[PDB]
Amino acid sequence: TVTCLQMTIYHPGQQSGIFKSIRFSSKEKFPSIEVVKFGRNSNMCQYTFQDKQVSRIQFVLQPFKQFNSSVLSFEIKNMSKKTSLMVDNQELGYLNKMDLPYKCMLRFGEYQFLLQKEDGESVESFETQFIMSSRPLL
Amino acid sequence: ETVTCLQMTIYHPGQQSGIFKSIRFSSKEKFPSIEVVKFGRNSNMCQYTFQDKQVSRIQFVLQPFKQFNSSVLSFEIKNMSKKTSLMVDNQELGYLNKMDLPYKCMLRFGEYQFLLQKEDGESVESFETQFIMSSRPLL
């Protein structure tokens, strides 16, 4: 079994078609060497959002292994200079990083992300899933 | 104006074989804060490479980050090797184990000896990396 990272997302103006590039309900497989990146640029980031307020790279999720542990954990890092990244109650500035827990709420600009880590046996690769939310998350 | 440079003194008993031939010394190569510096035998995957069979595809990676309540860049290390361990000073990092590097520390993997030393700067958009060879062992 592979370690999945479920990412429920939300945005006020999502009806315009910001998450058209984003593929929902799909466990896309990533190796542990690779680093998942978010933003607007297509060549730099994997998951893109069509918006001017969003930076070229908003943030990055990188997998790792905690000490005395046999499962992948994820670390976040805000790459935006303008907008802050609210990892739960913690404000992450430019290039500030923090280890993500099993469940957390990410907020930037007017976006709302609800990350949720489901553990797995494999450490060589992980997976990522996306779910569109109708109501606001918080 | 100034840039945060990372002085990296290195050593290997069999460095005479020609392991650090791809590595250029006494030259501060520029890198942006988005980029991640990687180390290993693989040519394209890593920036700084080592011609050796015992070295993994990617041995380890250095990545810049800003600590909280700090105006200068700091570096985090992560061991990408499955087989061989990575010794940060006295701490042993296994597969995908990470740790925030201090100003001065001794990285050790296999028979390689790396002495890192961070010289701070003003800019947080980019960083530098210089390489120096040692005749004697570092430890």
Author numbering:
A (entry chain B): 12 to 149
B (entry chain A): 11 to 149
Paper text:
TRAF-interacting protein with a forkhead-associated (FHA) domain (TIFA) was originally identified as an adaptor protein that interacts with TRAF2 and TRAF61–3. TIFA has an FHA domain, involved in its binding to phosphothreonine (pThr), and has a consensus TRAF6-binding motif [PXEXX(Ar/Ac); Ar, aromatic; Ac, acidic; X, any] at the C-terminus for interaction with the TRAF-C domain of TRAF6 (TRAF6-C). Furthermore, oligomeric forms of TIFA promote oligomerisation and polyubiquitination of TRAF6, leading to the activation of IκB kinase (IKK). TIFA exists as an intrinsic dimer, and phosphorylation of TIFA at Thr9 promotes its oligomerisation through the intermolecular interaction of pThr9 with the FHA domain between the dimers.
Size-exclusion chromatography experiments of T9D/C36S and T9E/C36S showed that the phosphorylation-mimicking at Thr9 is partially involved in the TIFA assembly in solution (discussed later). Although it is difficult to discuss the original effect of pThr9 on oligomerisation even with the use of these results, the crystal structures of T9D/C36S and T9E/C36S provided structural insights into the assembly of TIFA. AB, A′1B′1, and A′2B′2 dimers assemble into a hexamer with a crystallographic three-fold symmetry due to interactions between adjacent dimers. The buried surface area per dimer in the hexamer formation is approximately 1,400 Å2. However, the buried surface area per dimer in tetramer formation (AB and CD dimers) is approximately 1,100 Å2, which is smaller than that in the TIFA hexamer. In hexamer formation, the adjacent AB and A′1B′1 dimers interact with each other at the interface between Mol AB and Mol B′1 through hydrogen bonds and van der Waals contacts. Glu39, Lys40, Glu45, and Gln57 (main chain) in Mol B, and Arg34, Ser37, Glu138, and Gln140 in Mol B′1 are involved in the interactions. The TIFA hexamer in the T9D/C36S crystal shows a large buried surface area of approximately 1,400 Å2 per dimer, and the interactions between the dimers are also observed in the crystal of T9E/C36S.
